[PDB]
Amino acid sequence: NLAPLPPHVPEHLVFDFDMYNPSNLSAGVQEAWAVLQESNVPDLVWTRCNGGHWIATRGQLIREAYEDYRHFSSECPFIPREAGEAYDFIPTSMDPPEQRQFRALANQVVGMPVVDKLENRIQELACSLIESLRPQGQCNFTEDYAEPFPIRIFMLLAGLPEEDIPHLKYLTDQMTRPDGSMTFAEAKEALYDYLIPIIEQRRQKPGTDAISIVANGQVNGRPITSDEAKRMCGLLLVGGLDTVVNFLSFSMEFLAKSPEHRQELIERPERIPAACEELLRRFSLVADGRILTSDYEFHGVQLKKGDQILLPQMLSGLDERENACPMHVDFSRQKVSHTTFGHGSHLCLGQHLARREIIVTLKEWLTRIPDFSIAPGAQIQHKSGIVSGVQALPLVWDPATTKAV
Ligand code: HEM
Numbered sequence: 001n002l003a004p005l006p007p008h009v010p011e012h013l014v015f016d017f018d019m020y021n022p023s024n025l026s027a028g029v030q031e032a033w034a035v036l037q038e039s040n041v042p043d044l045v046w047t048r049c050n051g052g053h054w055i056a057t058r059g060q061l062i063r064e065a066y067e068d069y070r071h072f073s074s075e076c077p078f079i080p081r082e083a084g085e086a087y088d089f090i091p092t093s094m095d096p097p098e099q100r101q102f103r104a105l106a107n108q109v110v111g112m113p114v115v116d117k118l119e120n121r122i123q124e125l126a127c128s129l130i131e132s133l134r135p136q137g138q139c140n141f142t143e144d145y146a147e148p149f150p151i152r153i154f155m156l157l158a159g160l161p162e163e164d165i166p167h168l169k170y171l172t173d174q175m176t177r178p179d180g181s182m183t184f185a186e187a188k189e190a191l192y193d194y195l196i197p198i199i200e201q202r203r204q205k206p207g208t209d210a211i212s213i214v215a216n217g218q219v220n221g222r223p224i225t226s227d228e229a230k231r232m233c234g235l236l237l238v239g240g241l242d243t244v245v246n247f248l249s250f251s252m253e254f255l256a257k258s259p260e261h262r263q264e265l266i267e268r269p270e271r272i273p274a275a276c277e278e279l280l281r282r283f284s285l286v287a288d289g290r291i292l293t294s295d296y297e298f299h300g301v302q303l304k305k306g307d308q309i310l311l312p313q314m315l316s317g318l319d320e321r322e323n324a325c326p327m328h329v330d331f332s333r334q335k336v337s338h339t340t341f342g343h344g345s346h347l348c349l350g351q352h353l354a355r356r357e358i359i360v361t362l363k364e365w366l367t368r369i370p371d372f373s374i375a376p377g378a379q380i381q382h383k384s385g386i387v388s389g390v391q392a393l394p395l396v397w398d399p400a401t402t403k404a405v
């Protein structure tokens with residue numbers, strides 16, 4: 001259903017793309033979004049779906065807008081509008097200058113030095129999951145690896161019990177791919193209800209877990225408030241539970257369908273980090289945006305104060321003006337251009353954790369289960385939203401072709 005076109009939006013710029021249910025979804029979600037880059041589609045279009053909003057369709061505009069926080073504010077960064085208005089996670093809902101003191105604190109719980117200290121446990125968990133799967137000759141990848149591997153690591157980092165995963169995962173998914181049972185505001189209220197007593201507990205009796213570190217932290221040398229600590233911890237949980245989880249499934253679906261790409265990584269393992277970057281480009285998965293702070297003419301188009309603009313991080317790397325033959329996965333691609341982890345002052349703080357999780361997965365899986373395929377018959381379905389994903393990924397292999405390490 002289509003919101004009436006506002007007076008200021010030109011009719012020739014209308015392209016009614018629905019970011020939560022794109023027309024071409026059955027072709028694969030990145031393909032469905034890539035319809036925005038077909039030959040006669042402008043660089044900046046308006047969709048009347050999901051309340052009405054702009055979409056930048058090309059890397060050049062996506063990058064420019066993410067650099068210009070004075071015109072394109074993160075105070076309302078999600079479509080639809082009621083989700084963006086309710087969204088108050090820190091640091092994402094803040095612009096410079098005030099955003100930066102909170103980044104610095106977040107970076108202390110998810111930054112490179114923390115990832116270094118988690119390295120052994122990440123390795124161990126990946127190995128244990130894959131060894132337990134190996135003799136079985138099949139798995140449901142999304143439930144059996146893509147979910148438990150990154151999520152258990154996050155719950156370890158945060159000092160949260162694993163049995164809380166089903167509830168937290170349900171709430172996080174309502175924020176990014178809602179099934180309709182909860183609004184964003186209701187899912188956020190429920191995440192905060194979970195965190196409130198845990199934050200108070202850990203301010204009274206600090207531990208060394210991520211929640212204690214945020215809740216007792218300072219920002220530019222003054223103490224964080226309880227409310228700030230909640231709004232930061234909520235975001236960290238969303239990052240831990242609904243990013244890498246989805247990305248792994250796109251990457252493994254691809255590797256299951258492409259024996260020659262797996263053979264490349266089996267024959268030349270040194271290539272894994274490069275392969276991780278090219279998969280992060282091809283199977284990019286996030287699309288959020290910004291709100292106009294004022295009336296502003298951008299690339300010949302009159303934007304009005306309060307308009308929302310979706311700036312899909314997914315699209316920059318898929319743009320043939322950034323990467324030739326963008327739908328082709330080439331592990332030797334010379335200049336891998338992408339904004340998969342975002343761009344500008346909100347560049348992902350979890351990207352070092354994400355890459356370590358991805359590269360360990362590829363190394364440890366291909367080492368033990370070098371040969372596998374999609375279960376015969378399976379019609380793999382994607383789902384689209386703020387973070388896109390894979391509904392189910394049934395894999396099979398012959399245990400005789402596997403290796404214990
Ligand atoms: C493949 C995995 C990941 C992708 C593709 C991803 C992508 C993104 C993108 C696109 C943004 C910027 C959003 C904006 O500008 O509005 C971002 C921000 C952030 N992400 Fe990641 N993310 C991933 C993994 C993680 C993980 C594992 C964590 C935490 C455990 C995390 C924590 C953060 C935080 C805290 C921010 C906010 C930074 C700020 O606003 O200054 N992300 N992520």
Ligand SMILES: CC1(C)[C@@H]2CC[C@@]1(C)C(=O)C2
Binds near residue numbers: 092235386
């Ligand atoms: C868009 C994101 C991937 C980024 C980290 C989690 C997420 C859903 C946000 O709310 C900011």
Ligand SMILES: [K+]
Binds near residue numbers: 075076077084087088
């Ligand atoms: K808001």
